[PDB]
Amino acid sequence: NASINFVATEAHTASAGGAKIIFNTTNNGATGSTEKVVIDQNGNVGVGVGAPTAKMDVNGGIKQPNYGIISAVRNSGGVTASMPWTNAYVLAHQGEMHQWVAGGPILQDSVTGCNAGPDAGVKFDSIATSWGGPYKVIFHTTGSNGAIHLEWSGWQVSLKNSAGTELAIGMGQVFATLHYDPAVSNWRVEHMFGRINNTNFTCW
Amino acid sequence: NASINFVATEAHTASAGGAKIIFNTTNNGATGSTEKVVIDQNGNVGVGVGAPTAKMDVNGGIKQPNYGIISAVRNSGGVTASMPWTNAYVLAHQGEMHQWVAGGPILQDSVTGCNAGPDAGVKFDSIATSWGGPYKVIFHTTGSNGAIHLEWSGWQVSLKNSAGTELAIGMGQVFATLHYDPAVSNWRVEHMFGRINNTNFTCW
Amino acid sequence: NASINFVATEAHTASAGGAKIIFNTTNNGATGSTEKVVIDQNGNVGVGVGAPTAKMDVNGGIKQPNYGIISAVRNSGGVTASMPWTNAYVLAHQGEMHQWVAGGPILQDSVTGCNAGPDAGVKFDSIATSWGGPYKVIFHTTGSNGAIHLEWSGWQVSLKNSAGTELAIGMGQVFATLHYDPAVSNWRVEHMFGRINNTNFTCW
């Protein structure tokens, strides 16, 4: 059995007063329904929480889609990128965060965008492993085209210079900002910084 | 057309058994409704997910409000802060996380709070840019007053010493803990650490 | 008063057309109900948002459970761990993120797992404080057993070598990957990296 109940949340002297919506379902194998969600009188939503204090109060974990491995490499070989959203989608979905686990990103712009600062032209060259690491991607804009702010940490990453020489290899972390650049018909790294093992790197 | 259906999730030999709530809406331009949300028999909520494994299982992005630029500067000039929540609101909303994109924070306490550790009295002096960066703010408490744990990374940040001398400028990241201090009638930085380019800084 | 309304989201020439579900509740002390949640025609859920652009669009904060302090220490003394989930639970809840505030983790493997790389065998030895810091834990897998990717930053952390000698103490940040290792009947640190004050550490 499942049901939706409207429940008073205070005494009602006038016919009208505070009220909430509760959503009840019966667990498999059970015979009685139990309250699973509430939209409270204050608009707070409780999921497994009866008196939510947060606007979205979740008594458990939060899951989003696995968007795979992200890459954006501009070098002597040309412009490439693997990005699981279009420019138009990112622009339509401003401010949205996405977190998932996957192999690390491959990131470089040794032509223009990330060839200034202390470590001009480096490649954050993640080796995909079973361990991988968490991505965090939030959608933003240059004002005309889609941009993303991307974070990832995990195993294993090779930091290479613009000549391809491995400078270090091990654990890697990066914060990077990418944008869709119409002048090269693809996503590019505008700036990024992070670390491989104990070595910080920065380019812009 | 929109509708709410109560659906059995297993065979029912006794009149009672497992059941879920499904919420159907019709996309604009469509003629048939499609299932958009489920509150499952186990209480898991699926949003675009039919058999959610997570308590809140979202087939897309998650958005929260844009809370703007955050600042808390105590120096020779006095005590200032720009904080988009009151002390009372933070105390009423413990444990809540907030993520958004905006210009970086401006942070310093060269009088007391962040004038110890390796980089006593520095200012994390973010220049607001179109790129900005992601904030993460989670609400906490000293036990009496509101505290926040704040993270931000992005472009562009000037690291200054307590005398105003620019030590470095470029990409910046900070983790900082701020609290509402009644002794100065405002928010202050209790401790923070991060980096500008490849230079780590730490104060407490 | 509380209510659930099915509302057209466009003109309907044929009997069928786009529609949304709105959920209305009355705030305590109020006499009229106000719209608190919408499941839109496109399946986007707005919580305090009338025309959500995100699949889960929340006009406020997001809260999850406080899972306490996490530890996993393997050294000369043996194998210990404090982990608020079982192996089976983590494996059933892949891809789920969890964020909360608590005292920092205690992490080391000086026998095998984290006794390579630049800082073999170190202990990230968090001292629990009232300030604490934010955890982020996302669930993953080795392919057979539960793994977690864990992040924490905050006050106060002692970085110790494998001999117990305090190398540094102050603000601490860690990214660590832990997994349930049946060969020692407990969770262990596979690799981690972070910083105490301005000192980066890395082990794998």
Author numbering:
A (entry chain A), B (entry chain A), C (entry chain A): 948 to 1151
From the paper:
Bdellovibrio bacteriovorus is a bacterium that preys upon a wide range of other Gram-negative bacteria, entering their periplasm and consuming them from within. Proteomic and structural analyses of vesicle contents reveal several fibre-like proteins, which we name the mosaic adhesive trimer (MAT) superfamily, and show localization on the predator surface before prey encounter. Structural studies reveal a variety of domain usages (and therefore binding capabilities) at the fibre C-termini, placing these on intertwined trimeric β-prisms. Using independent but complementary approaches, we identified and characterized a MAT superfamily of trimeric fibre proteins with diverse adhesive tips, able to fulfil the long-sought-after role of multiplicity of molecular recognition and handling of diverse epitopes (across a wide prey range), by the bacterial predator B. bacteriovorus.
To address the potential for domain-based diversification, we crystallized the tip of Bd1334 (which shares 75% identity with Bd2133 in the fibre region but then diversifies), from S818 and S914 onwards, diffracting to 2.6 Å and 1.4 Å resolution, respectively. The tip of Bd1334 has no similarity to that of Bd2133, forming a β-sandwich of a completely different, square-like shape. Tip trimers are mediated by edge-to-edge contacts, burying 6,900 Å2 per monomer. A composite pocket is formed from two chains, making a tryptophan cage with W1078 and W1102 from one monomer and the terminal W1151 from the opposing monomer. W1102 has an unusual cis peptide bond often enriched in binding sites. There are no structural homologues for Bd1334 in the PDB, and sequence homologues are limited, with sequence conservation patterns being non-informative. Thus, the Bd1334 data show that MAT tips can be swapped out in evolution and that Bd1334 is probably specific for binding an epitope encountered and bound only by B. bacteriovorus bacteria.
